[PDB]
Design a protein around this motif. Sequence first.
Motif, PDB file in Angstrom:
ATOM      1  N   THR C 315       0.707  -1.123   0.074  1.00 38.53           N
ATOM      2  CA  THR C 315       0.215  -0.140  -0.054  1.00 38.53           C
ATOM      3  C   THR C 315       0.686   1.194  -0.083  1.00 38.53           C
ATOM      4  N   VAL C 316       2.075   1.243   0.384  1.00 43.66           N
ATOM      5  CA  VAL C 316       2.916   2.394   0.625  1.00 43.66           C
ATOM      6  C   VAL C 316       3.296   2.895  -0.808  1.00 43.66           C
ATOM      7  N   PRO C 317       3.687   2.108  -1.852  1.00 47.82           N
ATOM      8  CA  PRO C 317       4.262   2.606  -3.047  1.00 47.82           C
ATOM      9  C   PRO C 317       3.381   3.517  -3.705  1.00 47.82           C
ATOM     10  CG  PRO C 317       4.704   0.298  -3.014  1.00 47.82           C
ATOM     11  CD  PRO C 317       3.708   0.606  -1.952  1.00 47.82           C
ATOM     12  N   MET C 318       3.724   4.484  -4.593  1.00 54.06           N
ATOM     13  CA  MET C 318       3.106   5.559  -5.393  1.00 54.06           C
ATOM     14  C   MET C 318       2.727   5.020  -6.699  1.00 54.06           C
ATOM     15  SD  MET C 318       3.614   6.697  -2.465  1.00 54.06           S
ATOM     16  CE  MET C 318       5.360   7.475  -2.149  1.00 54.06           C
ATOM     17  N   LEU C 319       2.543   3.917  -6.874  1.00 54.12           N
ATOM     18  CA  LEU C 319       2.488   3.200  -8.285  1.00 54.12           C
ATOM     19  C   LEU C 319       3.130   3.882  -9.339  1.00 54.12           C
ATOM     20  CD1 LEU C 319       0.114   5.092 -10.556  1.00 54.12           C
ATOM     21  CD2 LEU C 319      -1.448   4.420  -8.393  1.00 54.12           C
ATOM     22  N   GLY C 320       4.282   4.447  -8.941  1.00 52.32           N
ATOM     23  CA  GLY C 320       5.033   5.251 -10.291  1.00 52.32           C
ATOM     24  C   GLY C 320       4.357   6.366 -10.706  1.00 52.32           C
ATOM     25  N   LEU C 321       4.345   6.557 -12.205  1.00 47.92           N
ATOM     26  CA  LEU C 321       3.698   7.865 -12.631  1.00 47.92           C
ATOM     27  C   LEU C 321       2.219   7.470 -12.762  1.00 47.92           C
ATOM     28  CD1 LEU C 321       3.682  10.252 -14.132  1.00 47.92           C
ATOM     29  CD2 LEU C 321       4.447   9.131 -16.377  1.00 47.92           C
ATOM     30  N   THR C 322       1.488   8.502 -12.606  1.00 50.35           N
ATOM     31  CA  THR C 322       0.132   8.350 -12.516  1.00 50.35           C
ATOM     32  C   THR C 322      -0.509   7.707 -13.824  1.00 50.35           C
ATOM     33  N   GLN C 323      -1.999   7.527 -13.655  1.00 50.30           N
ATOM     34  CA  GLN C 323      -2.599   7.081 -14.815  1.00 50.30           C
ATOM     35  C   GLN C 323      -2.577   7.899 -16.163  1.00 50.30           C
ATOM     36  OE1 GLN C 323      -3.313   6.153 -12.013  1.00 50.30           O
ATOM     37  NE2 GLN C 323      -3.360   4.104 -11.521  1.00 50.30           N
ATOM     38  N   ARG C 324      -2.863   9.320 -15.813  1.00 45.75           N
ATOM     39  CA  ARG C 324      -2.911  10.104 -16.930  1.00 45.75           C
ATOM     40  C   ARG C 324      -2.464  11.647 -16.554  1.00 45.75           C
ATOM     41  NH1 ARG C 324      -1.926   6.964 -19.676  1.00 45.75           N
ATOM     42  NH2 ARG C 324      -3.002   5.648 -21.171  1.00 45.75           N
ATOM     43  N   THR C 325      -1.723  11.461 -15.529  1.00 48.04           N
ATOM     44  CA  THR C 325      -1.018  13.076 -15.109  1.00 48.04           C
ATOM     45  C   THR C 325       0.195  12.648 -14.528  1.00 48.04           C
ATOM     46  OG1 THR C 325      -1.809  12.857 -12.629  1.00 48.04           O
ATOM     47  CG2 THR C 325      -3.390  13.549 -14.019  1.00 48.04           C
ATOM     48  N   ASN C 326       0.993  13.778 -14.396  1.00 44.10           N
ATOM     49  CA  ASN C 326       2.575  13.737 -13.825  1.00 44.10           C
ATOM     50  C   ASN C 326       2.547  13.348 -12.432  1.00 44.10           C
ATOM     51  OD1 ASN C 326       5.125  15.351 -12.727  1.00 44.10           O
ATOM     52  ND2 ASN C 326       5.471  14.567 -14.888  1.00 44.10           N
ATOM     53  N   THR C 327       1.474  13.660 -11.591  1.00 41.20           N
ATOM     54  CA  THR C 327       1.533  13.210 -10.131  1.00 41.20           C
ATOM     55  C   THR C 327       1.612  11.625  -9.972  1.00 41.20           C
ATOM     56  N   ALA C 328       1.342  11.213  -8.666  1.00 42.01           N
ATOM     57  CA  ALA C 328       1.239   9.984  -8.336  1.00 42.01           C
ATOM     58  C   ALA C 328      -0.117   9.534  -7.472  1.00 42.01           C
ATOM     59  CB  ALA C 328       2.350   9.253  -7.695  1.00 42.01           C
ATOM     60  N   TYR C 329      -0.286   8.339  -7.099  1.00 44.17           N
ATOM     61  CA  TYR C 329      -1.432   8.159  -6.134  1.00 44.17           C
ATOM     62  C   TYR C 329      -0.824   6.590  -5.363  1.00 44.17           C
ATOM     63  CZ  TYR C 329      -4.851  11.306  -7.912  1.00 44.17           C
ATOM     64  OH  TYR C 329      -5.486  12.728  -8.220  1.00 44.17           O
ATOM     65  N   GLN C 330      -1.248   6.839  -4.046  1.00 46.61           N
ATOM     66  CA  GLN C 330      -1.105   5.776  -3.347  1.00 46.61           C
ATOM     67  C   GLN C 330      -1.297   4.267  -3.757  1.00 46.61           C
ATOM     68  N   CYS C 331      -0.625   3.292  -3.528  1.00 51.40           N
ATOM     69  CA  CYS C 331      -1.441   2.019  -3.967  1.00 51.40           C
ATOM     70  C   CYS C 331      -2.696   1.532  -3.282  1.00 51.40           C
ATOM     71  CB  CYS C 331      -0.026   0.901  -3.708  1.00 51.40           C
ATOM     72  SG  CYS C 331      -0.687  -0.841  -4.171  1.00 51.40           S
ATOM     73  N   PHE C 332      -2.793   1.562  -2.137  1.00 52.58           N
ATOM     74  CA  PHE C 332      -3.993   1.304  -1.687  1.00 52.58           C
ATOM     75  C   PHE C 332      -4.266   2.046  -0.175  1.00 52.58           C
ATOM     76  CE2 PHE C 332      -4.241  -2.584  -4.283  1.00 52.58           C
ATOM     77  CZ  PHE C 332      -5.697  -2.549  -4.388  1.00 52.58           C
TER      78      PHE C 332
END
Lengths: 266, 132, 395, 118, 177, 123, 167
Positions: C315-332
């Motif tokens: 759950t910690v990782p930020m999934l790398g590059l976001t789906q369609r933006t330059n940001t990121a999102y937490q894994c869970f």
Amino acid sequence: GVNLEAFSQAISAIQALRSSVSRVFDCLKDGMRNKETLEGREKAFIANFQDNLHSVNRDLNELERLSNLVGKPSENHPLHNSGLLSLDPYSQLLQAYKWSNKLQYHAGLASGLLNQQSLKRSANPQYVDDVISRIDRMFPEMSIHLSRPNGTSAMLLVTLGKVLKVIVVMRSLFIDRTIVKGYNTEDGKLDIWSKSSYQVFQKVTDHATTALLHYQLPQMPDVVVRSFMTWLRSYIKLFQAPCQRCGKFLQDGLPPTWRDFRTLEA
Amino acid sequence: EVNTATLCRIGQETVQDIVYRTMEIFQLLRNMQLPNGVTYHTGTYQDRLTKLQDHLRQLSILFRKLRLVYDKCNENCGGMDPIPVEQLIPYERREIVEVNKKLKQKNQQLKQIMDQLRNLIWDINAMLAMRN
Amino acid sequence: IGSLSKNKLFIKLTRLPQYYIVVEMLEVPNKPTQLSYNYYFMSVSSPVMALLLQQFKDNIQDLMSYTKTGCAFNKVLAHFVAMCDTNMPFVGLRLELSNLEIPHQGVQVEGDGFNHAIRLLKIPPCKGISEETQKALDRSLLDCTFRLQGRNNRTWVAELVFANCPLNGTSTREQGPSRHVYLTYENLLSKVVEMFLNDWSSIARLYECVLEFARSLPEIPAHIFSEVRVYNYRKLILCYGTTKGSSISIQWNSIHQKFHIALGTVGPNSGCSNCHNTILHQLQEMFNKTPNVVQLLQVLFDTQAPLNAINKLPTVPMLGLTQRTNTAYQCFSILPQSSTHIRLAFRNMYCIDIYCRSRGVVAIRDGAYSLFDNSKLVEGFYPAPGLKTFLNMFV
Amino acid sequence: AAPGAPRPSNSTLVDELESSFEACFASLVSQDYVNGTDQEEIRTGVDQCIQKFLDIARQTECFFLQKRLQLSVQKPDQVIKEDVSELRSELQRKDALVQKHLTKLRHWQQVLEDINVQ
Amino acid sequence: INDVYESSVKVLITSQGYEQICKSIQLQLNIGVEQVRVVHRDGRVIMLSHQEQELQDFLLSQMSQHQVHAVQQLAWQVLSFSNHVGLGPIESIGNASAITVASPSGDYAISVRNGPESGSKIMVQFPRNQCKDLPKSDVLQDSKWSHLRGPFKEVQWNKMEGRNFVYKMELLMSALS
Amino acid sequence: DFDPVQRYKMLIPQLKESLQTLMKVAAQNLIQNTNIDNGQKSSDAPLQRFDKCLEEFYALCDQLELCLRLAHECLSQSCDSAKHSPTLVPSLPYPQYLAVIKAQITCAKDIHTALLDCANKVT
Amino acid sequence: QPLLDAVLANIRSPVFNHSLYRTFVPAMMAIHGPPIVSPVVCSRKRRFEEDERQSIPNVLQGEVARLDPKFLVNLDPSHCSNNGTVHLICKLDDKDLPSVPPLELSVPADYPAQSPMWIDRQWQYDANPFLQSVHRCMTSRLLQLPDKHSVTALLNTWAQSIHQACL
């Protein structure tokens, strides 16, 4: 990057706000169990509002706010996600980072509490010394230097902020025979042994000798000289004297316990 | 060749060494930073790896010897097995004593010799005090 | 009233409570020597508080010396200075402690101790449950003792013991009576009794808590039983993972009247982190509502499997590059807002909520409905995770 | 049976030392994922492990000392032989130090004669 | 580095086979200008006489006390309540050199009173369960306590299996089997 | 493109005002319930749902908590990356960095396996 | 800021504290689902039987347990059972010279007094001149004792006066 601690504090604060909300709404879901004289427990309700006042503590986060607003897109992390899609085994790097940090803190606490040694006794290199001195010289406002004018022993001198320079003769380790001299120094052609002072710097030299005889470890001279350098550098201010006034005696300097205070206090 | 008291002393020293080696392995684990930090790529890395490998092998041998000496002390319960002097703590040997006396006499002789040697050493230090 | 002579003070004893003074008794008839060192004593506290007390034994101190088994005059001046040097702290402690109870001073340690010690009697009750906890406490209470520890400058140690303690701790060689209790104190300017009584009140609260454990759990002893760890003033238990793992602890904080809990990390067959801290905060608030530790133990036994299972996933990782933006999102994104009800989302989207309540019953729900789906939504995370019902009904 | 006053238990104080040693090490490495988050949760475990380790080491040393005293008061001949061996070792160490000092002194005599030769 | 006028020596207690007993280290800088000034662990600047050496024996006694304290810290956990000398047990024989080390370890407690000829070997050790007592107002007394460590039971430190004063743990070991 | 600090700053006043509104409506519902039950009917007006209020409050609370947790995780990631690797990215050759990361992972796995074999030998 | 709930709780005078149940618990059990937040059984008898009933107030017991073994306390004729609670009939059996046993009758554990009463002293002290001096010294010491205590202070002062006034 201490802002991580600030964000963790903010998380704890908002979780405490949620918990306080839950607790006060649960307490409102109950009445006077057994008062028999006055329902003073309603005052606890007001006390619960104090915990809701702890929501203003989350407002304190606005002081800790503005912690991170920069570029640096995740600090060289994306390798497979933003890179080779087939490179899915990335997270192993973060796993190793956490593992290393956990091991570091674990061993640190272990060594810190392992001071209670259990070994009774042991029964049934000038280049290294210069290198250790140069490595210790890596701290700011602590310009030191050595020359070794006489003998194979080490002659080291330190000058931190003032003309209170100190000389310490070493035998590749456990540098004994300390001599501090405020405002002159290396008379003749090399280091001197005048040891003249103002009845206070001589006391400082006595303290340094006491520490050297006190901070002497059975081995690992690196930690020894490190503690020595820190203990000497702790004298950078000489401006405060707790546990008494600023004029208990001629001068109030003795930080042997990681804190300066008034002299003549043991 | 009983050496039973010496065996118990050796076991005590061995558990003390086990504790000290635990302290040492912790002090050597705390300073194991990232491999590609600055320069310690594999050299000091693999060096301390082999160091801790030898540490664990030595500690395993020490545990083996501890088990062995514990089993020996357990099997040593022969004759006067209860021996209640533990809770009852108080409140030929001639040849050994003579050998000890001769050893202490030779030790006193060597002590006088070392006294002369250190007197000469202090004298040499005095000479060096006169040096330029 | 004395002749021309020097005097002295103390530092390691105190600042300046008692001036140490000696006068050379001159004009000795038929002898130009033997000044006899006429001792005196001052209680100055700044004008000198003139309290001489005439406290001196000279020259009958030689009689006290002959009473025992036994070239300067150290043998008498040392006694006459060290007696006050070791008495002044104890008399000050007695003066400050006379407020609470039984400030009897001078009881030597069996005589052969040769060291001052202050024994107490009937420490006053605390603001805790004085109905029955105070009763059994004083029934098991024994005398407390204060002694001078440290490097004789400023350090007071306290030894406390009780009768047969109810929290029978094993794996610690607990004696017949309560084993021991020790408390250090070192003031900077001398209030130590305040911290002492605060510690005692904490001891009373934890003793009540442990006394509340005298019962029989239905199935917990199967999870052999390791909850009798070393107990002086912080309980410790481990009924998890069929071994001594996740040892929840119990202590006290002086600043806030709330208690404190923390699980243990020791154990071979345990999780690497194995820290239920992710929910600890939540449950700790629960502990402030019901101090019955058996309830905490049971809810922990319940949440053992769900907590560890839901933490197993990354759950910690930020999934790398976001789906369609330059940001990121937490894994869970995980958040256990309550005891057992937790919230789980992916990339701050499509939250779910699973929670175990019964022996094995763990219910799942979509966290974007707000108990009324036909009305509106939660103005946030996107609803409709899909056919999760049948996806779970598969098994 | 554990929470009560009696506590029948055996088979300890021999391998239990190694058990307590290996206890606070599997939390570092195991065949389980390690969460990438930790804050003072490790100290609560390591303090307990370390104090239990020190306690069991003291227990083992006390057992060894008890056996020492029992066999000493029972048969002091072992103590006499141990003192004899210690004296032998001290004499050997003294002889070795004397030989080393003599070698150094002879080397210094040689180099001093060479320096005086000019 | 022996200078033209002064020098120094570092001395320590060095108990028989115990490197952990390093509780005092005296650095003496000797010079013909005045009396020698020595510091062990406290910065206590001192000055002896030409024939005064009893300070060495006083340091010896007090460091023996500190050493038994430290080794008690090594093996139960008897706290630091052992001070230098409380009011003087033996009239301070040996220039104020009076040692009094108390140590409550567990259910027992050991208190030694050393000193420079002021009864150096004066040690007692009392356990909880004893034989001689007064059960008149105590046996019938409620809450029969096992904490009645009344008698002294003097250790009588003669012919004890101690090499050089350093085996107080050796008797403390005989407390828990 | 909103930022974590920006989303926090815009959510905090919404959270505070939602708390105020839910507390006001809870007090209104309570006084209405008491007047209808204890006393005579005087509040002849329909109250609110009262469930949506605290429900959306907890929703915004969860949102804030998880975004702050994500920000903390990002900062921790940056710190651990700077500690375990030098700051160099397009400067450092990317394949060389990937190989260095792989070697770091292999070295950590080797250290872990060594400690595990050590623990097993202790058993 | 939300003092409205405060004034409402102030309004909550009537005894029917059950409307708040129907007001709050539906949503509470809906969004929070711990129907058993403490399924552990709780059934303990508070007071079955707990009393000494076989000795004096144990306060003086715990006090006298601390005193030196050189003090031997016994039981006098039964006149200090519960209220007085103390008949300090002590003997100084030690290496020092013996003397007459003290009386030292203290009061209930509230301690608005001390022990020394000295009933049998009238003939025990005036007969022997040395013992009379001992009594004089003990009285002078007790008068200088500010608020002496039950067993420790009195017995300590008595022993020190007995072994100081030897002369």
